[PDB]
Design a protein around this ligand. Structure first.
Ligand SMILES: OC[C@H]1O[C@H](O)[C@H](O)[C@@H](O)[C@H]1O
Ligand SMILES: OC[C@H]1O[C@H](O)[C@H](O)[C@@H](O)[C@H]1O
Length: 375
């Protein structure tokens, strides 16, 4: 069926977002440079009705120096979204990754994490939480009328099932998460939706840890409207059953669910990638299409619990997964894709992955036909 369909140009193909109207919006992560790209722009206007900044709205991009906010790139994304009636998601207000280090220096300029005096630690905590509020207030007040969905905190639970021990936690403990949400609500109003975003939300012990955390926060009156599931998944993992169990679990707490950074990798973990996009055989696109078919069939079934599904990219010509696309080589210098085969060396991030339902040349892939139809 969808496997025999023609690989027509995606630029004029049936609109993806329209196919899912009344079920959930369809979004894409974007980089400013793409807004100056003829085809990326066409793709956005054509298939998507929700947009998120892939990188220009993260903490270090907004306030790399205390008191100096750089909204130039962010403004460009928001402006484009408004001009095209697209919903907007804010790519995290708090995150341990690439966090501006100045946040964690005490009044004297010393690393807060080194402080041992409980009273000085309390003082440092107040300073950090104050900075956190200023950061959130400035951003939220600037975009509250345009950006409705917000990833207030990102990846705050470790993969070991424990709260991520980042400087935020080491210094302020669990309170940095409570303050982030409360600050967002206070300065953003009751109309914006606040989310806790993370990856591997379907995997234990992370899933239950995440569950308990949000359950306790809500019990304490902390304003959190939903969970963001990054969904950096593979062809057969996590299973649809676990994804469904995960979605229902959180919806049961009265939380909204949004697939925030969806991409269906062609590989496992650790990934053994193909060296180039052309090296990827049709067979791989067929297994991927079958997965996408099951995936969006499950999402529709749960449409009452999912308000948005965003892809972490537009088309296969641009995806952060290439940075993870390690190419393995045997002793004879030949590529090794078989995950169980022996190898000699590894060329990290030199390969290519193909995530999406749209190829590098902006043509629809089998995966597209699989989620565009009603079968
Ligand atoms: O953060 C990246 C990785 O995290 C976990 O190890 C996942 O199992 C793996 O698939 C990948 O998502
Ligand atoms: O969303 C997850 C992903 O986002 C960006 O692509 C970053 O560069 C990656 O390191 C990872 O944090």
């Amino acid at each position: 069926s969808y496997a025999k369909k023609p690989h027509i140009s995606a630029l004029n193909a049936p609109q993806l977002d329209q196919r899912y109207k009344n079920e959930f919006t369809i979004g894409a992560a974007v980089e400013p440079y793409q807004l100056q790209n003829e085809k990326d722009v066409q793709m956005l206007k054509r298939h998507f009705n929700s947009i998120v900044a892939e990188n220009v709205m993260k903490p270090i991009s907004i306030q790399p120096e205390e008191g100096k906010f750089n909204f130039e790139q962010a403004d460009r994304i928001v402006k484009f979204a408004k001009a095209n009636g697209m919903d907007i998601r804010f790519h995290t207000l708090v995150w341990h990754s690439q966090v501006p280090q100045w946040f964690f220096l005490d009044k004297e300029g010393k690393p807060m994490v080194n402080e041992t005096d409980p009273v000085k630690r309390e003082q440092n905590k107040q300073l950090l939480l104050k900075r956190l509020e200023t950061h959130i207030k400035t951003i939220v007040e600037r975009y509250k009328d345009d950006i409705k969905y917000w990833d207030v905190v990102n990846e705050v639970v470790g993969d070991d099932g424990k709260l991520r021990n980042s400087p935020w936690y080491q210094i302020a403990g669990i309170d940095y998460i409570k303050v982030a949400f409360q600050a967002a609500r206070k300065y953003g109003g009751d109309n914006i939706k606040l989310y806790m975003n993370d990856y591997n939300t379907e995997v234990e012990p992370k899933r239950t840890a995440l569950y308990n955390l949000v359950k306790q926060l809500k019990e304490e009156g902390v304003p959190i409207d939903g969970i963001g599931h990054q969904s950096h998944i593979q062809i057969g993992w996590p299973s649809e059953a676990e994804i469904e169990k995960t979605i229902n679990m959180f919806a049961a707490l009265g939380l909204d669910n949004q697939i925030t950074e969806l991409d269906v990798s062609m590989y496992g973990w650790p990934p053994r990638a193909y060296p180039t996009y052309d090296a990827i055989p049709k067979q791989k696109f067929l297994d991927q299409a079958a997965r996408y078919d099951r995936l969006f069939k499950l999402y529709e079934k749960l449409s009452d619990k999912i308000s948005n599904v965003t892809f972490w990219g537009i088309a296969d010509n641009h995806t952060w997964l290439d940075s993870r696309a390690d190419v393995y080589y045997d002793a004879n210098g030949n590529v090794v894709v078989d995950p169980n085969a022996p190898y000699a060396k590894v060329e990290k991030g030199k390969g290519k992955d193909a995530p999406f339902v749209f190829g590098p040349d902006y043509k629809v892939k089998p995966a597209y036909w699989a989620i565009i139809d009603h079968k």
